[PDB]
Amino acid sequence: VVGGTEAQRNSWPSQISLQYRSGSSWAHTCGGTLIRQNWVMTAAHCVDRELTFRVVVGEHNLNQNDGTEQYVGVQKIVVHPYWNTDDVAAGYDIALLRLAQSVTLNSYVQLGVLPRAGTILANNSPCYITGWGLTRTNGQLAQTLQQAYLPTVDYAICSSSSYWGSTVKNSMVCAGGDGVRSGCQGDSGGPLHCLVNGQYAVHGVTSFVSRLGCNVTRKPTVFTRVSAYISWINNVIASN
Ligand SMILES: O=CCCNCC(=O)O
């Protein structure tokens, strides 16, 4: 997250760190949202590579022991059948990860509230992106969980010429684009928490940013719209 502030330890308990094995250690690659005690919602591109993945819930600092973390392996990866690795712009950048063990719930580990099916936010709706992604374009990962206010940019404005054009689909949510705040590499798969009727709900799964940079004016961070996949999410959980 570029232009973010350090989130409070118990502000976003559904945020998880998706990590891969690298030698004798583990490295953060993406974010995710805990949706069931044994299920994590992330981006499909995050699991494109044939790496060994683990999920860390109750995580705040990646480099230090917070004394609140629970480490669990990934038992099954269910990517959306329509996902194409050669086309992130086509959408369907969503995947569900079944955890090997069911995580224990507390103030640092809670389930993410999902929006009702078909919910589209009005333009400039209040949202917050969270993650351990790069703090600057071509920078490094954040040590502590970062948050940034990213108001929504509706389909009409985001799919216009000066913005994203035909790249953005209606199955996506766009947020930010102020040139200071945005998602960045490593935030992918993570949540976009939006305030609807007093409650924060995970309306987006971080998908992509501009190739020219993360915090680029008129190039808001693009997320997979969670409300377009409620039936899919429920069908996967019910069959597995
Ligand atoms: O697009 C999201 C940030 C980059 N994700 C790369 C990855 O970890 O797969």
User: Are 32 and 14 a contacting pair, CB within 8 Å?
Assistant: no
Which tokens hold the place of 118?
């078909």
Which atom of ligand 1 lies at the shortest distance from residue 49's CA?
A: 9
- Closest C-alpha residue for ligand 1 atom 4: 185
3-class secondary-structure state, position 235: helix
- Closest C-alpha residue for ligand 1 atom 9: 46
Q: Are 1-12+112-227 and 13-111+228-240 equal in CATH topology?
A: yes
Beta strands per DSSP E along 80-186 = 95-99, 127-131, 146-149, 152-153, 172-175
Q: Taking Cα atoms as reference points, which of 53, 18, 215 lies closest to residue 134? A: 215
What's the gap in Å between 56 CA and the centre of ligand 1? 17
User: Are 122 and 114 a contacting pair, CB within 8 Å?
Assistant: no
Single-letter amino acid, residue 201? A
Beta bridge partners of 130: 147
What's the gap in Å between 31 CA and the centre of ligand 1? 9
The residues near 130 (Cβ < 8 Å, ≥ 6 apart) are: 1, 7, 12, 15, 31, 145, 146, 147, 190, 191, 193
Which atom of ligand 1 lies at the shortest distance from residue 187's CA?
A: 3
Query: Does residue 193 carry a catalytic annotation?
Result: no
Positive or negative: CA dihedral 127, 140, 143, 91: positive
State phi, psi for 223 to the nearest 5 degrees: -125, 150
Query: Does residue 93 carry a catalytic annotation?
Result: yes
Q: Which of 17, 28, 45, 193 is catalytic?
A: 45
Burial 114-147 (b: 16+ CB within 10 A, else e): bbeeebebeeebebbbbbbbbbebeeebbebbbb
Ligand 1: residues with CB < 6 A are 29-30, 45-46, 185, 188, 208
Give the single-character DSSP code of 219.
B
Q: Taking Cα atoms as reference points, which of 127, 101, 146, 104 lies closest to residue 204? A: 127
Superfamily of domain 13-111+228-240: Trypsin-like serine proteases (2.40.10.10)
Q: How far does the chain reach from its first CA to its final CA, in angstroms? A: 33
Range list of H helices, 96-200: 155-158
Which tokens hold the place of 215?
């915090």
**Determined by which method?**
X-ray
Residue that has been written with the tokens 């949540």 in this structure? 191
Resolution attained, angstroms: 1.6
Tell me whether strands 53-57 and 146-149 are parallel, antiparallel or unpaired. unpaired
Neighbours of 178 (CB within 10 A): 16
Query: Does residue 11 carry a catalytic annotation?
Result: no
Which atom of ligand 1 lies at the shortest distance from residue 189's CA?
A: 2
Radius of gyration of the chain (CA): 16
* 69 is known to lie in a ligand binding site: yes
Residue 116 Cα distances to 91, 95, 164, 218, 231, angstroms? 20, 19, 26, 28, 10
- Closest C-alpha residue for ligand 1 atom 7: 46
Q: Which of 14, 28, 93, 187 is catalytic?
A: 93
What's the gap in Å between 186 CA and the centre of ligand 1? 6
Domain assignments of the chain as residue spans, ordered by start: 1-12+112-227, 13-111+228-240
Classify domain 1-12+112-227 at the CATH topology level.
Thrombin, subunit H (2.40.10)
User: Are 181 and 204 a contacting pair, CB within 8 Å?
Assistant: no
